[PDB]
A paper describes a structure:
KIF1A, a key member of the kinesin-3 family, is recognized for its high processivity and fast MT plus-end-directed motility. Mutations in the microtubule-associated motor protein KIF1A lead to severe neurological conditions known as KIF1A-associated neurological disorders (KAND). Here, we present 2.7-3.5 Å resolution structures of dimeric microtubule-bound KIF1A, including the pathogenic P305L mutant, across various nucleotide states.
Other classes show single MT-bound heads with a trailing-like head and a missing leading head or with the trailing head of another dimer occupying the leading position. The most distinct conformation, termed T1, was exclusively observed in one-head-bound classes and is characterized by having a docked neck-linker but a nucleotide-binding pocket that is semi-closed. This intermediate closure suggests that binding of the partner motor domain in the leading position may stabilize the fully closed conformation of the trailing head. Intriguingly, in the ATP-bound state of KIF1A, we observed a significant proportion of molecules in a one-head-bound conformation with a docked neck-linker.
Author numbering:
A (entry chain B): 1 to 430
B (entry chain K): 4 to 373
C (entry chain A): 1 to 440
Write the structure that this text describes.
């Protein structure tokens, strides 16, 4: 039995966590009160992965909610599924970081990290055989970036063998809701590259593009973006909860997707997306899923794959389908787009198949890409960082909390080295 | 630069003597031949090093390489060649129980000393020979170890925490709050080495009863000044001499480690692989631009993949001379491991870096202002 | 008496075992709950054929099987399925996590602590057994758990038993398609295991079976169930001689000695002739000559490997059903007359022949027509070497840059093990090259 401990920090992390717990709860038939009102036996076969049994025959999610501001905790509690979470896992203080990475990491978060780790240590000790952790947090903010990076560092010190996932929201190219996004982004990326096994990159620009272009929504809100993200997270860990022709735990992906330790930044995607009225026209088949998976505009990371090369990709299908069709479709995708895949990794497409699709759909698929285009994102951030570090635009807010310019220099150097490492393989003819 | 892969064969060991004790390594001058114990009919693997040595028969003198021969072929030659402003990197790549310490230290009491005694005593005698009113020097030393991607201090008292690795923008990677010392004489270096060697973590295994489970580093920063103020500039030279011992690859089938031991071995192997990769990459890169066309487009060397290569960024390549001592054994069990070591040697032995540094700005400022 | 023990490792092994035990239960008239009504109706004979099933006091029949896996999911699918009452509750599941397509995890770190229990169960079965013939090991190259645990298990078995035969059925990586990035590493690292310890390894490729399904059976979207059923038919044809009566019976040992000219060349290709749908079963005679000729067709081979590019070192035919030796001799003479089939000059005898009276059985819901005659052909040829060469290329393309290596090195494996495995594979290729040269 393989258990995943879920952590969520900051406003964005807590919102995505709430939506994610609503989606998974449906798949496994869990009432808002915690009682089980499902129909299929398989819903309870592997309930232990995300949930703990309570004494009253009700299920409590294994989640840790973290913040430095009671407002988000109050919003989560006063919600459709607020009662599902146990009250002891609401760890919070007051006087939030306020978009200051130093406050989140050094000053404010250091006082609260002890309490958080305590809950984590407890939740972890109860599990029979822990697979790994996963953390949701936006890198653009203060509380999210700071406390997430600190918790990741502490946990990796405590649990070196386990797996560390991360569904993090990067700052967008054009859209910018804060003035000091580049500083927090650079420091968080410096911390993440060393102390993580996987890191799924999400961008609000890409999600808005999906909502407008594909789903044809007129007035999308953060609920729809959280819906898409939660669909991806539920898609990733499908094989640890249902049977299938080919299983694939989180590790099997980590092994198959990470050629070298520093290259673990993935681009996620989901299919199908029929836009509420065009489903009657398109016929749902495996080739259609493959086409929509490998499309450029479907990616959630706001980075064109066609500007780089695919180091390696993974496709997790859900539903009843034939293995020959899947294998031949992956082979055809390789052969047709021969120039967008590296030449020294033959057959660089991982495949997993599960036979329990989502409730409302006949078939579905999740795409995880690892390409060289992601460097563009970091490169962009680096430029902005330089544009504010040459003159020390807002440095006095950070240096007042104990940091120094040296740490900024280390972060910039590490980010540039990561970009160069990614650019190493994006070439032709060697 | 250089790596000068000292392919050395030591006497037999009780574990080897339990088996068929037959040496599988021979030579003629610079030619080194290695027989395949499983396929003796095959032509032995042949290599051309100028620095291959054989000390399995110590009392012999016919084609016998004493440690003084090794020092003459590598030690003083490398020292004087790198003396004109270089960084010298001597490190011991080998296997478990492969005699990696006798190369590094050797018989201190005897005249058959390892590389460090000969190098340090020769340097110290050199500076003493050139000690004068207008000619002076200054030597500093430091010791550190890497347990499993964590740096610890051996000279300083017990600090149970792990030192934080930092990156100065100009001076490159370094260790925060690492204890550093100044040294006047060679015997002080010997005492500090004894203390550091005692301080390191050690555990027993089948291949060797006292295998070291950490990667040790010993830095020497050595500065030279001449004070003919009328027509000379003080602090006219400095050199960095790094002496590193690397725990050998843990052949898990031949050791059967379990629990924490296995974990240590795992980390060790990972680190070693990264080091090997760097030594394979760096070589090719420095081989390409130096020989091919002078293009210098871009070449990436994966330093950050491990703490060992990260801390030795200045010393392993770029602007540093280097050195490896391939500590082999004459056993049949180690033929594949020896072949791997000398295959990485084939992916090494030039490295080809450039340097010439260490002026004195303040002393020339006297002439500039006047 | 005659009996053999089946071992299944990994998801592929477990699913092939599901198909195999479905076919055996259908063959011997055993219900999924282990009971046999035939003993109450026939009241005689030996319908509880002891080659596979052990009979208890109450009339239940427990199969002689040992399922092994590292994922609880695949075994739990069986422990709550149709055949939940058939198997002994001891299913030997590692309740930690899968090897994750990693040889080292399956062989060094996690493979331990479970090998002891598997050997204890196998020892109990062997002690319960009398006149044991050998082991039938089912696993898959490329997969981490299959590779690593098959290596460890075979290493222990060669020491514990030694002289008992060990036949291996394995799924080699495909030439073009694949379901993993690190397939070449796992496939190459099993060369030592398959060479030293295994006595005879049968190889099947997914692409070949997909092509057979598409062309012969006329199935447009086949899945793994059809592949497993075909492999189960192959194994049933191999092992039929130990159970049902026949004119010319061939046990496992006499089967073995007629297929291995030298110790290191035990890699025969397998094929099944009358693969045909119910619709096309009509308009067809399916005589002995027709199926014998269809056995040698390049399209019907179970591995993507043209036999016309190599020479046939040996061949063994196993017929089932209404077959007479006259037609078999005529077909053999016709095959020898042909030019396209090239035999080595040092094997004038060529063929081994066996005939069995029991015809093949039709699984309900299957895709194979009911036929009166069938034949399975197992041929040791040189052309298999070509397939290995292809795989070797892939390995090089991933080892020059040391891609994915750190995962293996961080689990106790040394880096030089890769080079050692590659050198062993090259030696095997050289051996297969040398043996095929004509004498002068
Ligand atoms: C008439 C009809 O076809 O209804 C469909 C539908 O129109 C579509 C458009 C649905 C619909 O989804 C959306 O409209 C939507 C809007 C914003 C963001 C995301 C989705 C649907 O709402 C979503 C719903 O699917 C589910 O509910 C899944 O099981 C999904 N679960 C949830 O959305 C969920 C929400 C709240 C609480 C609990 C579950 C899921 C997906 C992956 C993994 C786990 C669960 C389905 C099939 C439909 C409707 C109802 C219109 C789609 O849903 C998904 C999974 O993306 C949109 O893309 C698919 C394609 C479907 O055709
Ligand atoms: N022919 C056939 N091949 C299969 C079948 N199931 C799996 N395979 C092959 O087996 C390979 C991996 O099998 P396994 O070793 O069992 O995978 P696993 O159970 O997840 O365990 P790990 O490989 O260690 O991750 C895949 O690449 C498939 O090609 C099957 O039903 N039929
Ligand atoms: N040329 C030599 N002549 C005599 N004795 C030697 C010679 N070289 C090595 N030895 C001896 O052989 C042993 C080699 O040291 P050893 O115990 O293998 O340490 P080590 O193998 O270097 N530790 P490590 O390799 O890091 O696991 C010592 O007892 C030395 O005195
Ligand atoms: N997708 C999504 N993004 C959000 C949501 N709320 C905030 N964000 C993003 O997160 C960033 C602000 O980070 P914030 O949550 O305030 O970090 P914190 O203050 O440290 O908790 C903005 O750039 C938003 O685009 C949400 O509900 N959904
Ligand atoms: Mg040593
Ligand atoms: Mg497996």
């Amino acid at each position: 039995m393989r258990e995943i401990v879920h952590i969520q920090a900051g406003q964005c992390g807590n919102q995505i966590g709430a939506k994610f717990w609503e989606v998974i709860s449906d798949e496994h038939g869990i009432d808002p009160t915690g009682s089980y009102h499902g129909d299929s036996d398989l819903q309870l076969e592997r309930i232990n992965v995300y949930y703990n049994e309570a004494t009253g025959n009700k299920y409590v999610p294994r989640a840790i909610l973290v913040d430095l501001e009671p407002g988000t905790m109050d919003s989560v509690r006063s919600g459709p599924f607020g009662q599902i979470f146990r009250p002891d896992n609401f760890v919070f203080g007051q006087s939030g970081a306020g978009n200051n990475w130093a406050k989140g990491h050094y000053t404010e978060g250091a006082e609260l990290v002890d309490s958080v780790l305590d809950v984590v240590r407890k939740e972890s000790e109860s599990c029979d055989c822990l697979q790994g952790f996963q953390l949701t947090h936006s890198l653009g903010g203060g509380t999210g970036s700071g406390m997430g990076t600190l918790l990741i560092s502490k946990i990796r010190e405590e649990y070196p063998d386990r797996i560390m996932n991360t569904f993090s929201v990067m700052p967008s190219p054009k859209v910018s809701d804060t003035v000091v996004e580049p500083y927090n982004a650079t420091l968080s990326v410096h911390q993440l590259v060393e102390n993580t096994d996987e890191t799924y990159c999400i961008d609000n620009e890409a999600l808005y593009d999906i909502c407008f272009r594909t789903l044809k929504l007129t007035t999308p809100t953060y609920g729809d973006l959280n819906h898409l993200v939660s669909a991806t997270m539920s898609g990733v860990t499908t094989c640890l909860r249902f049977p299938g022709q080919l299983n694939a735990d989180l590790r099997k992906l980590a092994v198959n997707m990470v050629p070298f330790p520093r290259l673990h930044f993935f681009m996620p995607g989901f299919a199908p997306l029929t836009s509420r009225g065009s489903q009657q026209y398109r016929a749902l088949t495996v080739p259609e899923l493959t086409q929509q998976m490998f499309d450029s505009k479907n990616m959630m990371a706001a980075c064109d794959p066609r500007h780089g090369r695919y180091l390696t990709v993974a496709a997790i299908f859900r539903g009843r389908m034939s293995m020959k069709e899947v294998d031949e479709q992956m082979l055809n995708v390789q052969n047709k787009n021969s120039s967008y895949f590296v030449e020294w990794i033959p057959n660089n497409v991982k495949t997993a198949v599960c036979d329990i699709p989502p409730r409302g759909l006949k078939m579905s698929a999740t795409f995880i890409g690892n390409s060289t285009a992601i460097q563009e994102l970091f490169k962009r951030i680096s430029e902005q960082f330089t544009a504010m570090f040459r003159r020390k635009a807002f440095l006095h807010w950070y240096t007042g909390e104990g940091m120094d310019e040296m740490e900024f220099t280390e972060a910039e150097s590490n980010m540039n080295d990561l970009v160069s490492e990614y650019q190493q393989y994006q070439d032709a003819t060697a | 630069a250089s790596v000068k892969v000292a392919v050395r064969v030591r006497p037999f060991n009780s574990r080897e003597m339990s088996r068929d004790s037959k040496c599988i390594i021979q030579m003629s001058g610079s030619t080194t031949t290695i027989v395949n114990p499983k396929q003796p009919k095959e032509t032995p693997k042949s290599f051309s090093f100028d620095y291959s040595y054989w000390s399995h028969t110590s009392p012999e003198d016919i084609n016998y390489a004493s440690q003084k021969q090794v020092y003459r072929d590598i030690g003083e030659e490398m020292l004087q060649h790198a003396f004109e402003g270089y960084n010298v990197c001597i490190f011991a790549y080998g296997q478990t129980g492969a005699g990696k310490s006798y190369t590094m230290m050797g018989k201190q009491e005897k005249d058959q000393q390892g590389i460090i005694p000969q190098l340090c005593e020769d340097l110290f005698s050199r500076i003493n020979d050139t000690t004068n009113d207008n000619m002076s020097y200054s030597v500093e030393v430091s010791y550190m170890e890497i347990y499993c991607e964590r740096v610890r201090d051996l000279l300083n008292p017990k600090n149970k925490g792990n030192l934080r690795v930092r990156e100065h923008p100009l001076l490159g990677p370094y260790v925060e709050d690492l204890s550093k010392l100044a040294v006047t004489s060679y015997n002080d270096i010997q005492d500090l080495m004894d203390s550091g060697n005692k301080a390191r973590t050690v555990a027993a295994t089948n291949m060797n009863e006292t295998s070291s489970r950490s990667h040790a580093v010993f830095n020497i920063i050595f500065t030279q000044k001449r004070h003919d103020a009328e027509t000379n500039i003080t602090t006219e030279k400095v050199s960095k001499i790094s002496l590193v011992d690397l725990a050998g690859s843990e052949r898990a089938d031949s050791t059967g480690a379990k629990g924490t031991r296995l974990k240590e071995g795992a980390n060790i192997n990972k680190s070693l692989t990264t080091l090997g990769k760097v030594i394979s990459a760096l070589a090719e890169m420095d081989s390409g631009p130096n020989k091919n066309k002078k293009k210098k487009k871009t070449d990436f060397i994966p330093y950050r993949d491990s703490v060992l290569t990260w801390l030795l960024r200045e010393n392993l390549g770029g602007n540093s001379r280097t050195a490896m001592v391939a500590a082999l054994s004459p056993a049949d069990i180690n033929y594949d491991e020896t072949l791997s070591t000398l295959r990485y040697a084939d992916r090494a032995k030039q490295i080809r870096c450039n340097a010439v540094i260490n002026e004195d700005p303040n002393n020339k400022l006297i002439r500039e202002l006047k | 008496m005659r009996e053999c023990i089946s071992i299944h490792v990994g998801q592929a092994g477990v699913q092939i075992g599901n198909a195999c035990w479905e076919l055996y239960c259908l063959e011997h008239g055993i219900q999924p709950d282990g009971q046999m009504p035939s003993d109450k109706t026939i009241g005689g004979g030996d319908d509880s054929f002891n080659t596979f099933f052990s009979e208890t006091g109450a009339g239940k029949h427990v199969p002689r099987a040992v399922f092994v896996d590292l994922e609880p999911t695949v075994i739990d699918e069986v422990r709550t399925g149709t055949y939940r009452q058939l198997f002994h509750p001891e299913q030997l599941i590692t309740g930690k996590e899968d090897a994750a397509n990693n040889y080292a995890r399956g062989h060094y770190t996690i493979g331990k602590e479970i090998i002891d229990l598997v050997l204890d169960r196998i020892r109990k079965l062997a002690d319960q057994c009398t006149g044991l013939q050998g082991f039938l090991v089912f696993h898959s190259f490329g997969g981490g758990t299959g590779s690593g645990f098959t290596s460890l298990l075979m290493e222990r078995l060669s020491v514990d038993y030694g002289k008992k035969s060990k036949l291996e059925f394995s799924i080699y990586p495909a030439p073009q398609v694949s379901t993993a990035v690190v397939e070449p590493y796992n496939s190459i690292l099993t060369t030592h295991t398959t060479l030293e310890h295994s006595d005879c390894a049968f190889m099947v490729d997914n692409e070949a079976i997909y092509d057979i399904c598409r062309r012969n059976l006329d199935i447009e979207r086949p899945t793994y169930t059809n592949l497993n059923r075909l492999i189960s038919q192959i194994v049933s044809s191999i092992t039929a001689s130990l159970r049902f009566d026949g004119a010319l019976n061939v046990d496992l040992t006499e089967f073995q000695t007629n297929l291995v000219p030298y110790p290191r060349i035990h890699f025969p290709l397998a094929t099944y002739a009358p693969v045909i749908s119910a619709e096309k079963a009509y308009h067809e005679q399916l005589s002995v000559a027709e199926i014998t000729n269809a056995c040698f067709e390049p399209a019907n081979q179970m591995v993507k490997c043209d036999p016309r590019h190599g020479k046939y070192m040996a061949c063994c035919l196993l017929y089932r059903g209404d077959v007479v030796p006259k037609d078999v001799n005529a077909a053999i003479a016709t095959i020898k007359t042909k030019r396209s089939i090239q035999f080595v000059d040092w094997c004038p005898t060529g063929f081994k022949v066996g005939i069995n009276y029991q015809p093949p059985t039709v699984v309900p819901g299957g895709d194979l027509a009911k036929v009166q005659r069938a034949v399975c052909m197992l041929s040791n040829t040189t052309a298999i070497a070509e397939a290995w060469a292809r795989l070797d290329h892939k390995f090089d393309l991933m080892y020059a840059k040391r891609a994915f290596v750190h995962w293996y090195v961080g689990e106790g494996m040394e880096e030089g093990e890769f080079s050692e495995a590659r050198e062993d594979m090259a030696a095997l290729e050289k051996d297969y090259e040398e043996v095929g040269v004509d004498s002068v």
